Design a protein around this ligand. Structure first.
Ligand SMILES: [Cl-]
Ligand SMILES: [Cl-]
Ligand SMILES: [Cl-]
Ligand SMILES: [Cl-]
Lengths: 198, 198, 206, 206
């Protein structure tokens, strides 16, 4: 039995939708238990409301210290100027206690992301990899295992580093079927590796 | 005539000390006005106090929209697992309004950092560059203009991407004279470029 | 000279490698943008081929490129250099890497220190286009180049209605897995923007 | 075979380029660590030289490497590959870049998909050692390699009393601007840790 956490932040729902597909893929691996949780909001109340932040997410809020309860963690975040979101950064800064005891060492990790225009989607993933490496995570990219990555006929997210979605500058674009298939592939892929190492 | 902001976060003082050297270098350029400010704390009170956070920093707290009041900005941050600190990330996440109007486009930017063991010092700088590029900053590395970078006889911070210091895992190491000289070089180099573009 | 302040031309080199022509087309747009800046002299050159002849021929490499081949030493003759390369698995091409590996002498004398640099790229499917540029930035930083991204100055970047290259780090084009895609008008406009933007900064810094 | 279930050896390739021997010494330690893991077969090979003869000789290139030269196609013969390269301005060496550019056929067939990879590096002064590793990671990701950093599993990474190589991304050594430094005992311990760590994961995934 392997336990996977799908841990995400989502302000406008795009990452939340992708996380559902990530989790669906992971659950295809027999013997893998998948939990979806989100990191707490950090914006002050007035700014958050002014920005139209959503409060309908059913996923429970995770605590920093519980990450070591899992065998693999798939991290999801919207970009903030080519980095992970401040919400995810602040959450991961609180894992110093886990880092000092080696509590996450040798566990499996993978990353998915979203952007408004595609700009920064690659760097959001690989700069999250940096933090994973300091913890000693085994890092799983997806390469071109997802056949959708070869199709450039239409605006479509997804990179060899991990699944992505493109929300549009105004957030009007919802994740496409191809993007969700890439995320489902990533989830199952990370789950086969996590189960095999357990 | 030109205004430079040295904007930093410092929890244990190492970055604050480096910022003073950064500013000293910038003030060597005639006609350049240099201001030092810090980003607000984001840690909750109990964790911050339990962590031994310092409250003696004289620099005023900056606001996100004031960044456009300057012609060049030199950013300073300790690493959090190879990224900028959550404090700096959260602060810069609030610059979306400046980004939408192009308010920082074409300004000069440079970065310095600190780490406990040296690990992640390079990636802290260049993952901050990613955010600067999304704003359209002109990005200034220092290369090997600082002669101290060739001396590897002893532990010493500083990279071709920007000045750094090494604090030790317990924070007992203070910035060396060589590290501070590299920061002084960086400050003057950035200021010269900023003044020349004005 | 009595009564004269010399007016010196800022010099831009567009330096590229292109196997199937996509980067070559972009470089023309980069150069077109730079030539919009008065007082800027623009040169286009390419790096030498490094593949062995049989592999190159089997891969269908193009040999009709009119641009002269640059030498590593002449990089110091310019005030700004805009580098173009196709990706190789998310890095610059081996051809460009080999060429820049020969600039150790320029590095030791600081010959490129303080010059302006910018980067554009191409990929087959989009994968690695961002990293190709920013991992080229790393080498530029070791030389002390001032690094110029383009941000979202080009309005084309906000239009996600169709497959289109162009990043805040620099212009790109998407060639298709088989290389059958040609640079679109929008991608070329992003490259024209980059050239003019870089040329303006180089001229002002001169 | 009646009553027998085959025990298959996991295979590790330590693949490196070394101009002045620093990476070569590190590769020996990498391999030593891997051979500590039972059930792992360890091979050390190098990538071919790409510099022209006169430049190579003028630069003092070493010709005493006993490691046989690898071909790009044989990478698919292994379960895990630990790559070693000196930096060239914060990237992998052109020699390694040229070698990996020839793996397009393996990439198209997915021949390296799901294998284990890890990276070690060297620099003259420390500058760019982190980016050398993580920009090599990019290429590994395009092939679908599982990427293994070392984190802070090696206790030597906490000792900042002296100039020491090694990062959470992989082992490194610092050669000095003139190349006169040799890998220290601590740096070699980190490399031995990396080899054993990668070998354990490769054996478990097999
Ligand atoms: Cl979102
Ligand atoms: Cl600090
Ligand atoms: Cl091309
Ligand atoms: Cl070497």
């Amino acid at each position: 039995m392997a336990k996977i956490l799908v841990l995400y932040y989502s302000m406008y729902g795009h990452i939340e939708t992708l996380a559902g597909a990530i989790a669906e893929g992971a659950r295809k691996v027999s013997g893998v238990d998948v939990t979806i949780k989100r990191v707490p909001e950090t914006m002050p109340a007035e700014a958050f409301a002014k920005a139209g932040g959503k409060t309908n997410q059913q996923a429970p809020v995770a605590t920093p210290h519980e990450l070591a309860d899992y065998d693999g963690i798939i991290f999801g975040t919207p970009t903030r100027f080519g980095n992970m979101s401040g919400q995810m950064r602040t959450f991961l800064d609180q894992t110093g206690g886990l880092w000092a005891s080696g509590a996450l060492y040798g566990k499996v990790a993978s990353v998915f992301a979203s952007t408004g225009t595609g700009g920064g989607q690659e760097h959001t993933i690989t700069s999250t990899w940096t933090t994973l490496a300091h913890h000693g995570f085994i890092i799983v990219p997806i390469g071109y295992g997802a056949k959708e990555l070869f199709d450039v006929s239409q605006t479509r997210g997804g990179t060899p580093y991990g699944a992505t979605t493109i929300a549009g500058g105004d957030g009007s674009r919802q994740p496409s079927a191809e993007e969700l298939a890439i995320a489902r592939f990533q989830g199952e892929h990370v789950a086969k590796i996590t189960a095999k190492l357990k």
